[PDB]
């Protein structure tokens, strides 16, 4: 994984969507991996948040079957998974523990950077 953000904004299944809304306002992130400690359990994006009562807990609307990737895999292998399943953000897990995150944008930018490299 040459491309991933190791400072990951995560949530717990017992946090409320009112608190997740604050994280979107504070961090300007679309999705957040759901963790118990450092262990991935689910993922929640803006899709799954609108529109439920602010007291609703994350664990009831989060996606449990998370498409992730390992740090021992290439960034291009994640770009294939993101395109083959039309999935925005991919958590990066090692021993079931969230260590980073890579998403489409993160890899779409790599295309443009590689375009301009003939010096």
């Amino acid at each position, epitope marked *: 994984m040459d491309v991933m953000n190791t400072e990951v904004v995560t*949530v717990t299944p017992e946090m409320t969507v009112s*608190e997740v809304i604050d*994280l979107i306002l504070k961090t300007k992130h679309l999705g957040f991996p759901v*963790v*118990e400690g*450092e262990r991935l359990v689910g993922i929640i994006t803006l899709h799954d948040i609108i529109g439920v009562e602010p007291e609703e807990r994350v664990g009831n609307i989060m996606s449990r079957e998370v498409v992730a990737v390992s740090p021992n895999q290439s960034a291009f292998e994640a770009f294939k998974i993101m395109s083959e399943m039309g999935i925005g953000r991919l958590p990066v897990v090692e021993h079931g523990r*969230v260590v980073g995150i890579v998403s489409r944008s993160d890899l779409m930018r790599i295309k443009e950077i590689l375009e301009a490299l003939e010096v």
Partner: nanobody
Amino acid sequence: QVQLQESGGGLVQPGGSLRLSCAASGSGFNNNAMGWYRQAPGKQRELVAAITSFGSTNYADSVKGRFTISRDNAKNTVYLQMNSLKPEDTAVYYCTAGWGATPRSYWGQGTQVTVSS
């Protein structure tokens, strides 16, 4: 912008209880999520417990129930209360600040907690 000064720690007999504290100073700090990471001699860095500005906690499986986290919003300081300290809890305990359930943006210098008989 962000500074994290850790306090507490040191020797503690096996099964005893010890508390850590971490003060958050600076103008770049504004009700951030604070947590505790540790690292044993040979092992890698590992989350112990974190707590957001809302008060939502997040513990590892390994210190769950034994360790409880709390914070003082006006003092902008966090408290890690360690109980029933096993010898595998001997590590350098780092204080972190950031956003979410696993804050890792800003780190402390680490305080040594030794659990030996």
